[PDB]
Every structure is written in C-alpha cells, then in structure tokens.
Symmetry: none
Subunit: 238 residues, 4 copies
C-alpha cells in the first residue's frame, strides 16, 4: 500500500523503486524496510503508543510547524527526481531532499522515557523538540547496517514527502537547554489524547493557535537531525 | 493533464529532467490532438496514424499489445527511463517506439521509415492509433542520434492492444495477410483498413492458428530478443517518397 | 588474492572495494564474483580450456594488440578514480573506464563451438576476433541479474586494468564478414598450445611479429563489445 | 614514496580528485621532513611534534594506536575517503586528526588548539611523532572551506601505537598523570618527555590498572562512540598564545 508516505506534506507526491534501487547492498543489504503498525490494523487509525512515538529536533517555531507541518527541503513538483530521492546521499551528506528525519523516542524496560538521540547544539539558543505520531516512515535501523555508510542514526525514521501538521501532537520550547514552554497542537489527528502530553511540572502548557504571539520565538532546517550533528548522550531517565 | 501516457500498458520529471538544453532547445514535446477535445475518443486520422515494425506475430501483439522491454517488476528508474540512452543505443527501457505513417500532399500514403531487414523473413507492420506519445521530432532536432528518424513517436509504458487496429504479415518482403483487431478501440473503423487487393484480410482471434508465424529465433526462448531491433534508428530509414 | 586483475595491462594498477560497494542490490544481488579456476592451482599456469576461453571483438589490428594487449580507455595513474571504476555506469553507457570487456566463447553439449555474442557491425569492414586466456576477470553473469540494469552481456567477463598481450593467443582478421587471416601470438603465455589454434581450412595461419607488414589492416575502441551493439545471433555450430 | 601514509595501521587519487582547485589551489600537501633523509628515522623534533585530544585511555590507545572510525572491513572508498566532508562534518572516515604542538620564537611551548570540553571530565592529550600526514594548512585556504584549524595534520589510515610517545591524563582540566609508551618507536627519547613537576610520570604496560580511566559514556557498548569529537574544528580553538 502507500501507507508509507501517507503523512506526506507534499500533495503532489515508482517512487519506491526510485529511491530503493539506487542503493548498494553494502549500505542496504536486505533492503529498504518500512514502519509496520503505524496505523491500527482495526480502525485505519494512527497508532499512538510509545513504540511508535517519534521526535524531531527543529529550530523553527510552532507558528510555522503546527501550521505547515514538516515540509522537505525539496518542495516543488519540478524536482530533479534523481538527486532528490537519493536516500543514502541524504543520510550521508544532508543534501536537500524530499526526506524529513525523525528519531524514535527512547524508553527503558519499564516504559520510562530515557534520553533520545540529541543534537549537539541542543543547549544553545532556541530549539524545539517536536512530538510526532504518523503513518509509515522508513525504518533506517531495519534498512541499513550499523557500521557501514551512510552512517545514519539507527533510531531514525525517514519520511519521504515530510509530515503533515496533524501528526505533530506537541513540542517543547527550549532556551539555552532549558524547557520554557510546552505547546499543544489542537489540530492533532487524535485530540482525545492531547491529554496524555507528558512534561515537567511548573512549565506553562500552552495551546497553540495560528499566528500565536509567542509561537514564533527562534534564533536570529535539517541540520540538527543530521547524524553527525548529534548522538544518544546517555540512557538516563528524563 | 496525463495524456502523454494514456496508451501505457513524477515519471515525467524523471524523464524531462535529464535532458541537456543543447539536446532539445525547445524541450520535451508531445504529439498534439491525439484525441478529440470533445469525445476524448482517439483521433483516428492520417495525421495521427502510427506504425511499428515488429517480428512478433499478432497472437502475441493483438493479445498483449506492445510491452516495453522493462516491465514494472524489473525497473530501475534512473536508467530504464533514460530516453537519450534508449534512442542512442536501444538499451532496454520502458519505451516503445513507433513511426509516423507517411503521406503526400494529396493524402496518399508513401513509404514510411522502414527497417533494413524488412525484405528478410517474417516481419509485421502494425497500425496504431493511440493517445499521447513523445514527439521525437519536436523534442530533438536531427541531433538525438547521428541518423535520426524524424518520424518517431515514443510511448513510455508501451501501448495496449486495443490501440493496434491491424497489421500486415510480410514474408520475404511480400505481404501475405492483413490482420484485423476485432478488439480495436473503435471498431466502427475496422472497415477503413486499407490494403492490397487479392490478399486475405483475416480477422484475428486469440490463439488463432496462423497468427503465430515468426522467425525461428524468437522461439529459442533460451536467448533474449531485442524485439525493439527493427525500430532502432540505425536499423532503418525512409527509403523513398514513392506511393504505395 | 589479487589474481582477478593479474592479467592487467595497466601498470600502476581497495580497488575491489571501490568497485563493488557502489553496486546496487537490484543489479548485483550476490555482488561481484570473480572468475574461478582461471589458473592451475597446481602448475600455477593459466587454465587453457574451453570453459575459460574468452573472446574480444576489436577493430584494432594485432600490430597494436599483440604488442600492447588490451589497455583500458582510462590509462594514466592520475585517473579520477570515481568516474573511472564505476562498473554499472561502464556497462550501461560504455563511458571511458579502467575496464576491458570480453565475451565467453560458446560451445554445445558436445564441446563443439557455436556462435558467440557478436557485434552487429561484424559483417562490415575490418574487425578482429581475439582469443584470450587470462587470469581472473569479473563474471558479469554471476554478478548481475538478467533483465535488470545494466542489462550487461551475461556472457561478459570484465577485466579491470585490461589484459596483457601474453594472454591473447590468436585472432581472426575479418574483411566484410569473411575470415581473411588467422594470427598467432608467438609471445602467448603458453606457447606449447599455439598448436591447438582451431580455424577454417584454406585460410593463411600467419605468425605475428612486431611491425608485421600485414598486421596493421584496419578501418580508416570498446564500441563493438558494448551490450546493445551486439547479441548472440544463434546457436549454430561454426 | 608512500611516506604520507606510512604511519598507517588509488587512495591519494581518491582524495585529491575530490578537492576543487578553488579551495586548494596548490592542491593537497603532505608534511615533509617527517622522516630523516639518510637514516629513515622519524624526525623527533618540535617542528614535527603533534598532539591528539582523545577521551580514550592509554590501555586502548597505547595498545591499538589511533584507528579510524572506518576500517577496511566496513570501508566504502568513495565517501569514506571524502576529506572535505570529514573536515566539514566529522562524518566517519579513514582519517585521524592531530594538531601541531605550538611554540614561541624561543622554542617554548605555548597553548595548542584545544577542545572546548577540555576542562570537563577525563580527556587525554596524546603526543605523536609519525611519518607523513596531510598538511591541512598547506592544502587549504583559511579564507575558504571548511575552516579546520590550519594546525591540523590528518592521517589517512590512522596512526600506529609505536608513534605515540606519551599522553597527559586530565581530570576536570587538571593534569593527573603522565603516561609513557615503552613501545615508542625511538625509546632513546622517552627521556625527553616534558611535563609538570610533582605529577606521577608512569610507564604504561598492557592492561595497566590505571590506564583505563575514562568518561562513563565509553562503556555503553550498545551505543556508538564518536571518538573524533574533540578534534573536530568547531569543537575547539587555539585559546591563547601563553606559555605552558
């Protein structure tokens, strides 16, 4: 099915084979594998659990994100389908593509959240930690080998065509490594769960709305999700 | 819209994108008025009449139509959609070639681009009326090959049988039979099928007994067939401008 | 062992890695497989049998070939390694490389020679049919799938770095599709077998020597070995 | 010769062919006089003294030396030998970085390029004398990409332990011990190992009890080690020109 790009922010988004067959076995032996169970086999609804919780470190404010969602750097229909669907090259060099990266949320064997892959620049200035629950996505870990190239972040889940805002539940607004606010996306696909949004105590849990006054705080875009620009610092709880 | 590939049995950008500005100054150009703007019924006229020289019998063609050498199960998009490389080397692709039917300024048919091997053994001259197709002549000048066929129309994804109206069965350069495709898209015109007098005008039907006459080689399944061989530019030319 | 490039005419010739890794799974499922049993594990000599007999259609005369052997189009130690060791690109487009192509000689189940992959231009002007017995070579058939890019001549054996003259036993000189002479390489690696050189009766079996007067007949180089430029016409005997 | 990779554990070409003539007009330049003209002895002087800030203990380093993040095992020559990409992003490669040791016009050592994290936890300051290495400063422009400390010397294939003479063990920015590599290539000079007074000058030996002190992160085996982190241009700088 095409559940695999079902969250695509690109309306105008063969493409499987376009990406998939440009790959060496050295890099992707078994091959390109995808995310199974992103959507309830029963309802055709978005699976909202810890196993499928995803995150994206971005320096762009919700006024943009909660509005437009995550749109790939290659945004036009007149793309050079060729350089722009080259997964390995994207994963290796972070060259502009139709891909949008996210990282699995991490938990201990108790179901308690532990540190996730984190950008090295995380403690500097304004960066956001978006929470995503979306259908499909490429399981980088299952598609490639850990010591070989393009040396990606195994906890990575790549979304060809990006992700629509409706799949972004919330985001933490950090200022110099300190949580400052917790935003909630009223428009999230399954609002019944807007309640479950975890977060620190004594930190304003605001509800985003278009053109929100404080939803546009940012430094004076795929950079912090680039493998070499981060790592899983530790396995400590949060 | 999507007419350029309606005959088939992103993809656009995938093609048009690897085309040098010096390769096709004007850029990719598609056959115009291939269907009625009203009906959306194929434009079954002389302007849009197309032909394909093939050595495969109707039992195959009238059944499966023209299927590219590269199907969806063995496709490598970056390459298998490389038009210039297909046109220049005849490497396996998703493309299927045809040549415009030729007419004088009186509407009388004259010799079309013809394979050099035409007078040897069994070859078929299929008649096609299909939607879309790339106008090679309009897309390139006499510069996609050293020996251009100004008359080619390429169909990405091939052509379905319903667009193949008829075919002439040749044996050593001599018409032997004229086949008609009962399943042709617009049967009302099956009547207009021109052809020589005193030559059996048979009606094809699946597994027809005499609809499988072909050169020995096509039967040595062991070895692949460059079924696109006789449509390859260097393997033919427009011999003359004589009437038929 | 670096035998797969042993016969290399390229003097200055990681290289096995450089070529193989770039190859896609779709093309090379089991990946690059080098010819085996090419040399006596006993006598340490070139295995000179029908199984390992190879041929190369070339339009260059023996005065060149028997002298220099087959030197790749990319012959200079200062090569741009990346565009010049790309096998798939060579096999698909015939772009200049360090590779030299040959085709297996064909035999029926009786050991009788049958038609080999033949250039379409074979019947036009002067072309030569060189006979080779050399160590190593890439088994294209074993490395790639059929009806799959680069749709290489499965009967093909590719030699990175080319082949040295000492591995070229003989060659047929054709003039408009007709054998005119049969040349013998006195310098062939195993002269004891110069005797076994088969060929039509009533056709001069000359012995080549440098600057030979009639060893330079040619039309007024990897073209005729390019997949699309030929095919196995039939399975008839010779 | 092959001196420029002689300290290791087509390639030159693999590297040179991917460095635009803009960034590197005169091209790649390897250090020279790394080895002695006559003898073959490594040049053990101040001009050729090199250092590498690493968080891995001698029990590893003095044993295995500096092995690139990419071995021949998991090597993909096109990308794993991309110098500029390594220098710009610190992506895994076959390269191992070191920085020139700094001296005033009196021959007195002054502050070298130092990691910003230097004052935090356990980090080591290894002393190296090895053959070859790429002279980053001579190969690239500082008014150009990718702005690595021109004091860098890159070693394709890494460096063998025998070229690492000593190392300072720091704990929260304070020297705690000075290790000596008995196996150093030229033991006659193990004597010349400078260092602060009142700081234990230990002699390393395999599996040494205190030769394995390192930050907690390196024990998380399920997680991959970015060992080249503190040698990455943006992660450090030459703080000052003060003496030591």
């Amino acid at each position: 099915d095409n559940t695999w790009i079902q969250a695509a922010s690109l309306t105008w988004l063969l493409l499987y084979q376009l990406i998939s067959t440009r790959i060496p076995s050295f890099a992707s032996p078994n091959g390109l594998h995808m995310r199974e169970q992103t959507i309830d086999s029963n309802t055709g609804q978005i699976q909202i659990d810890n196993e499928h919780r995803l995150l994206r470190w971005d320096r762009r404010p919700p006024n943009d994100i909660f509005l437009n969602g995550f749109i790939p750097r290659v945004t036009n229909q007149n793309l050079s389908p060729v350089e722009d669907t080259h997964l390995l090259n994207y994963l290796r060099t972070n060259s502009p593509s139709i891909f949008v990266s996210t990282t699995r949320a991490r938990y201990n064997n108790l179901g308690l959240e532990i540190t996730p892959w984190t950008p090295h620049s995380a403690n500097n200035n304004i960066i956001y930690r978006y929470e995503i629950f979306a259908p499909g996505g490429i399981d980088i870990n299952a598609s490639f080998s850990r010591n070989h190239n393009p040396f990606p972040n195994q906890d990575e889940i790549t979304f060809p065509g990006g992700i629509r805002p409706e799949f972004i539940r919330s985001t933490y607004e950090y200022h110099n490594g300190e949580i400052v606010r917790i935003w909630i996306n009223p428009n999230f696909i399954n609002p019944s769960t807007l309640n479950d949004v975890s977060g620190p105590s004594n930190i304003s849990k605001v509800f985003w709305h278009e053109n929100h006054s404080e939803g546009n705080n940012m430094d004076s875009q795929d950079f912090d999700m680039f493998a070499p620009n981060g790592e899983i610092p530790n396995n400590n709880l949060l």
